Design a protein around this ligand. Sequence first.
Ligand SMILES: [Zn+2]
Ligand SMILES: [Zn+2]
Lengths: 86, 113, 63, 61, 185
Amino acid sequence: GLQNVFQSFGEMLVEPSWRYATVKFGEVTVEKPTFFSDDKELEFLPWHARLQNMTYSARIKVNVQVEVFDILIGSIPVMVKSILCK
Amino acid sequence: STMKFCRECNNILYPKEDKEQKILLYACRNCDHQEVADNSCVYRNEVHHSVSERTQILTDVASDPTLPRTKAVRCSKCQHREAVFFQATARGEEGMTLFFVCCNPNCGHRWRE
Amino acid sequence: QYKSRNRELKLDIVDLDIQNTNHCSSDDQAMKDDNVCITVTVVEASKHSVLELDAIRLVLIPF
Amino acid sequence: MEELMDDTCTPLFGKHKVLLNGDWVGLCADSESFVAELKSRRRQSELPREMEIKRDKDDNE
Amino acid sequence: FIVRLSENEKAEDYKRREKVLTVYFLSTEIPVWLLFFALGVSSDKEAMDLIAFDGDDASITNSLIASIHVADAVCEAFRCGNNALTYVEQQIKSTKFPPAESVDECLHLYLFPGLQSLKKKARFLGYMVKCLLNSYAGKRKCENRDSFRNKRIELAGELLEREIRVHLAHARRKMTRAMQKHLSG
Ligand SMILES: [Zn+2]
Ligand SMILES: [Zn+2]
């Protein structure tokens, strides 16, 4: 579902008026929901998000390449017991 | 409403009455061709008043009214007052005679005026 | 109703005679030998400004 | 299933239309021997199981 | 691609007031018989063999005759050569936001993209006109919204991506508006 979203968009050329900009997006790679604590990247469970009042979400990373003639883009909420779940 | 097709143009034809010949002709608008018509019929339509398509069965259009009922009579078989009256003709009579139909579900009797 | 309702659009009509006939000679489809026919004829004012087919088909017939 | 013709002059004699997701993709001569042969491939794991095969004689498609 | 069957509001001389077949494609109302002749069809006979009606009605044939008349009056000699494509190009190009592609290529990726040939999408147009005439003649029932046959449900595969896309369209607009201020020194 994410590849059809990130592959049906066409980025227009950044022309303010040489030197112009053109950005593109590559393959979509979604990780697993972890906990970014002070010790390490711990395992994040759906009841930890329920008890600490936070979102059980996983970060989305896409391939960004800028050409002139793995970048974080957001986080999707994760349903419990999905294809990526603890 | 009757449409014909052109011989060489294979397009639609239009009826054109020749004022100098007092006849009916079908002339093609695209190609220069004037065909001879037949039977002088340029329109035919079975008159159907169904101008409300897919909407006549929702609201009561009343295309078939009911027969009136009276209660100032009495049937012969049962002693019921309610009866359906209407007007029709007989098998060989000339005019219109009043008929009666009993409203009782077990009577099944009908009589004339 | 023709002589009392001027809601029909003007086709430059001066008269409209209706000739009742129990047996018309229109050789189109002889399917009813026990029916009557009604012929509606428009009176033109010595010209061909009424003789178009679309106006007679669209205005005179539903009137 | 036969391929849909290209010329606009060839008329359809008795070939019923095939509409895959609302798109015309071909023609079938006898649909009663077509749906009965297509459902056997669905009942043998040769087709997707979530595929509706409808055959109506009112619209001939 | 919306094909309606209504009265002729355009070019109405208060006499020709019957129903007509018009389409609504790319915000440009053209008659359907110009769109028939613009794609492969060269005669009225093979344009009527495509719309297979096989019935006897007076509201269908008069509407087809009115469509032929409004196609022949709006365009002169449209049934010979390629005069219909010029009218189709001028009707799309006169819109408020016309596409930048040529109109000879807009009929290959906008008008029925599931079909390949330019003559096959004319047969599909004739089939679409045939279904409308059969529904108008009472030989076909209209689609009701209460039935689950004409209804599809969306739980998370269409509800979530349509909210992902309206935020990606804002993230792609908050990116160019911040890269334009850091591109020209
Ligand atoms: Zn009785
Ligand atoms: Zn007669």
